[PDB]
Design an enzyme around this catalytic site. Structure first.
Site, PDB file in Angstrom:
ATOM      1  N   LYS A 158     -15.142 -47.269 -56.356  1.00  0.00           N
ATOM      2  CA  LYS A 158     -15.615 -48.613 -56.045  1.00  0.00           C
ATOM      3  C   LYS A 158     -17.023 -48.457 -55.481  1.00  0.00           C
ATOM      4  O   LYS A 158     -17.274 -47.583 -54.662  1.00  0.00           O
ATOM      5  CB  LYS A 158     -14.718 -49.378 -55.062  1.00  0.00           C
ATOM      6  CG  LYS A 158     -13.216 -49.293 -55.342  1.00  0.00           C
ATOM      7  CD  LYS A 158     -12.642 -47.992 -54.767  1.00  0.00           C
ATOM      8  CE  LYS A 158     -11.096 -48.049 -54.732  1.00  0.00           C
ATOM      9  NZ  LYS A 158     -10.532 -48.097 -56.101  1.00  0.00           N
ATOM     10  N   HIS A 193      -5.558 -46.967 -47.174  1.00  0.00           N
ATOM     11  CA  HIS A 193      -6.243 -46.749 -48.451  1.00  0.00           C
ATOM     12  C   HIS A 193      -7.398 -45.742 -48.414  1.00  0.00           C
ATOM     13  O   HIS A 193      -7.855 -45.281 -49.439  1.00  0.00           O
ATOM     14  CB  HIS A 193      -6.735 -48.093 -48.968  1.00  0.00           C
ATOM     15  CG  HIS A 193      -6.980 -48.130 -50.437  1.00  0.00           C
ATOM     16  ND1 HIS A 193      -8.228 -48.356 -50.975  1.00  0.00           N
ATOM     17  CD2 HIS A 193      -6.126 -48.034 -51.486  1.00  0.00           C
ATOM     18  CE1 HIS A 193      -8.138 -48.360 -52.297  1.00  0.00           C
ATOM     19  NE2 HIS A 193      -6.874 -48.168 -52.628  1.00  0.00           N
ATOM     20  N   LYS A 222      -9.735 -42.627 -48.420  1.00  0.00           N
ATOM     21  CA  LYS A 222      -9.683 -41.310 -49.017  1.00  0.00           C
ATOM     22  C   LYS A 222     -10.686 -40.362 -48.386  1.00  0.00           C
ATOM     23  O   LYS A 222     -11.898 -40.460 -48.594  1.00  0.00           O
ATOM     24  CB  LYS A 222      -9.854 -41.384 -50.533  1.00  0.00           C
ATOM     25  CG  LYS A 222      -8.569 -41.758 -51.200  1.00  0.00           C
ATOM     26  CD  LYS A 222      -8.610 -43.132 -51.681  1.00  0.00           C
ATOM     27  CE  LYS A 222      -7.256 -43.504 -52.284  1.00  0.00           C
ATOM     28  NZ  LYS A 222      -7.265 -44.968 -52.283  1.00  0.00           N
ATOM     29  N   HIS A 250     -12.121 -45.732 -61.082  1.00  0.00           N
ATOM     30  CA  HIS A 250     -11.256 -45.864 -59.912  1.00  0.00           C
ATOM     31  C   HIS A 250     -12.181 -45.816 -58.692  1.00  0.00           C
ATOM     32  O   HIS A 250     -11.806 -46.136 -57.562  1.00  0.00           O
ATOM     33  CB  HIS A 250     -10.172 -44.787 -59.899  1.00  0.00           C
ATOM     34  CG  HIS A 250      -9.128 -45.008 -58.853  1.00  0.00           C
ATOM     35  ND1 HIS A 250      -9.193 -44.424 -57.608  1.00  0.00           N
ATOM     36  CD2 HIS A 250      -8.015 -45.780 -58.850  1.00  0.00           C
ATOM     37  CE1 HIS A 250      -8.156 -44.816 -56.881  1.00  0.00           C
ATOM     38  NE2 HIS A 250      -7.417 -45.627 -57.615  1.00  0.00           N
TER      39      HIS A 250
END
EC number: 3.1.4.-
Length: 422
Positions: A320, A102, A104, A318
């Site tokens: 967090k 996950h 990025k 989107h």
């Protein structure tokens, strides 16, 4: 600016809301440096689109895609990449069930040095169009002059921390990137790296990742009725009640410093319904009915998405973020931006041992790294740019958390449409 924290560009809002914002084309622009090669760590990719984000002059430079896709998804990713011989892939091992790659991150190697970008966006058009996403841009890290004898380490230990993160993939293609980092000076870095990597961690290794990593940094480097604010786009199953994990281990880690209120920000159905995208925004907020029905107790912690400060109340989040504001929200003890959502998979769960299913990555902004004790909150997006409005607003009695796999048919959205999954 000491923070180098940015939001992505949003189409459909006034220019003033995009003035200090970045689009992926901006990040990969020639002004940022003369590209030699790059690595793109992510969850979802649209390769055709990605390659078009690179400047025409840089499109032929080598690109490594680091993903976690398996079997047919993997075959499909390879097929997407085939036409571009400059692109290689690295499949991150996911040896624990139900994990995801996950993280990025972009590693950008230039003739002039190295840049690291840690952010929240998938590499698909939709994630850079009308969503609220976060970006941290490292300084241009110069290469260490052969003949000099230098660690290139920062007081936050970012360099070693980033190498440990990459070392955990145990991947041949990453080794070259590790050696590249070794060769550069990352001493100017003023953020702490917070990573998650799949595994079962014991003894001291528990502190290396997830929420225990955050806990360790807060204990070492940070009227304590200061709330904790958590803001995310997905929720895993947290258990039958708050004592099972949320308030017990997750909250405990986050309240660490040196009856606390826990506020969670996650879009309601109305927030989604009236967004710039309408209901389809909800395709990127994957909270499933199967999970939610098992934990209705959690929704009493839920607060609406509101971002007038950055003109993004209609741009579904989107990004967090996690943070610790004072009782009146005028200041904060710390701020974290990361790819980790609200789930055990991302943050870890105790078993003693800590079990983590996924790769996640974020950066923590601590006042002590800037020689401060707190950051004042920037009112309009030393003062930290919090991208949403404070204080958080509780869901009204008629609000519901966005759940993506049930239909919404009583009220049409921004575009006159209904939402019917199936």
């Amino acid at each position: 600016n000491p923070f180098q924290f940015y939001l992505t560009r949003v189409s459909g809002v006034k220019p003033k809301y995009n003035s200090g914002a970045l689009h992926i084309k901006d990040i990969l622009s020639p002004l940022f440096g003369t590209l030699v090669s790059s690595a793109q760590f992510n969850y979802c990719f649209d390769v055709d689109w990605l390659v078009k984000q690179y400047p025409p002059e840089f499109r032929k430079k080598p690109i490594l895609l680091v993903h976690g896709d398996k079997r047919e998804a993997k075959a499909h990713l390879h097929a997407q990449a085939k036409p571009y011989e400059n692109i290689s892939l690295c499949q991150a091992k996911l040896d624990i069930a139900f994990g995801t790659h996950h993280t990025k991150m972009m590693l950008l190697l230039y003739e002039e040095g190295l840049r690291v970008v840690i952010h929240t966006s998938n590499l698909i058009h939709a994630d850079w169009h009308q969503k609220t996403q976060g970006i941290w841009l490292s300084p241009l890290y110069p290469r260490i002059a052969d003949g000099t004898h230098k660690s290139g380490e920062s007081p936050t230990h970012f360099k070693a921390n980033l190498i440990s993160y990459l070392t955990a993939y145990n991947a041949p293609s990453l080794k070259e990137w590790i050696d590249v980092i070794h060769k550069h000076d990352l001493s100017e870095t003023n953020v702490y790296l917070i990573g998650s990597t799949p595994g079962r961690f014991q003894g001291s290794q528990k502190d290396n990742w997830g929420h225990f990593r955050l806990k360790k940094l807060l204990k070492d480097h940070a009227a304590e009725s200061w709330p904790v604010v958590g803001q995310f786009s997905s929720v895993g199953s947290l258990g039958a009640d708050e004592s099972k994990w949320l308030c017990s281990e997750f909250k405990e880690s986050m309240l660490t410093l040196g009856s606390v209120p826990l506020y969670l920000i996650y879009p309601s159905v109305e927030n989604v319904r009236t967004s710039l995208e309408g209901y389809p925004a909800g395709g990127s907020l994957p909270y499933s009915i199967q999970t939610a029905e098992k934990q209705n107790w959690l929704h009493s912690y839920f607060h609406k998405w509101s971002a007038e400060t950055s003109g993004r109340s209609n741009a579904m989040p989107h990004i967090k973020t996690y943070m610790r504001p004072s009782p009146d929200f005028s200041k904060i003890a710390w701020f974290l931006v990361t790819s980790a959502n609200l789930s055990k998979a991302a943050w870890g769960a105790l078993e003693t041992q800590l079990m983590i299913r996924s790769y996640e990555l974020g950066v923590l902004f601590l006042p002590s790294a800037l020689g401060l004790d707190s950051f004042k909150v920037k009112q309009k997006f030393a003062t930290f740019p919090v991208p949403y409005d404070l204080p958080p607003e509780l869901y009204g009695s008629k609000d519901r958390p966005w759940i993506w796999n049930i239909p919404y048919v009583k009220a049409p959205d921004t575009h006159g449409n209904m939402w019917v999954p199936s």
